[PDB]
């Protein structure tokens, strides 16, 4: 522990919306300090979204205006994508970093496959 709960795959309709769940159980002493969502480009995961103490940032231009990440409750950092494009099909990684009181960081990630259905 902690571990992320993310489904193996999700579907969304072309030009519609989809949610990519990413949830976890908050743990005493584990302060969430970073969230990233990444898209897989071959061997390399590429950040598309970052949340840190400065707020939320979309990191790849093709997702501008189309990406939100849940922030109402601790432990839910699910990603919402809108106006889905066929080229949004990909493996996506949810990645969360926590810091404990001693300054150690703990990182967890988990993958889903998004399939965009015409």
């Amino acid at each position, epitope marked *: 522990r902690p*571990i992320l709960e993310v489904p193996e795959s999700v579907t969304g309709p072309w030009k519609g919306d989809v949610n990519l769940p990413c949830t976890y159980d908050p743990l005493q002493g584990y302060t969430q300090v970073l969230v990233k969502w990444l898209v897989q480009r071959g*061997s390399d995961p590429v950040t598309i979204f970052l949340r840190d103490s400065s707020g939320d940032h979309i990191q790849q231009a093709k997702y501008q205006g189309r990406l939100h990440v849940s922030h109402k409750v601790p432990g839910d950092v699910s990603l919402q994508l809108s106006t889905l494009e066929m080229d949004d099909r990909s493996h996506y990684t949810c990645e969360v970093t926590w810091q404990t009181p001693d300054g150690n960081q703990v990182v967890r990630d988990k993958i889903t496959e998004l399939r965009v259905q015409k």
Partner: nanobody
Framework: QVQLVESGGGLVQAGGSLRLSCAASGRTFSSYGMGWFRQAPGKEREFVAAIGPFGYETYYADSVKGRFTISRDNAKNTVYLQMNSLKPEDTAVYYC??????????????????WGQGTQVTVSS
């Protein structure tokens, strides 16, 4: 439906080697990370090695680095552990496991959703 089936354990002399195999069936595991763990009787299970889903990314416990090699053939959904330069303290039950981590958390047993049955490795002088 899903099972991870291990094989290849047995008795070897120190300095010898074994190949463990973990055949995963019931679904495609090409985009899963795979791991090996080991446990001695009455002791805690501990990390041995892992291989990520993407690229060519392998990870090892310090105690086995340079001696053990994890590898996979995705066309057969099988992960291997080549255990070279074996030592008596490598004696344990070895388990494979599969999960959907990418780069992180591969030593956390909670992060693997499917586990093999274990196979016994014994190394004698």
């Amino acid at each position: 439906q899903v099972q991870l089936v291990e094989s290849g354990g047995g008795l070897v002399q120190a300095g010898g080697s074994l190949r463990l195999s973990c055949a995963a069936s019931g679904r495609t595991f090409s985009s899963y990370g795979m791991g090996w763990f080991r446990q001695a009787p009455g002791k805690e299970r501990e990390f041995v090695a892992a291989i990520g889903p993407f690229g060519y990314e392998t990870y090892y416990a310090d105690s086995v680095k340079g001696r053990f090699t994890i590898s996979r053939d995705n066309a057969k959904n099988t992960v291997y552990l080549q255990m070279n330069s074996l030592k008596p303290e490598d004696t344990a039950v070895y388990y494979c496991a599969a999960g959907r981590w990418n780069r992180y958390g591969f030593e956390d047993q909670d992060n693997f959703d499917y586990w093999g049955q274990g196979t016994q490795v014994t190394v004698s002088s």
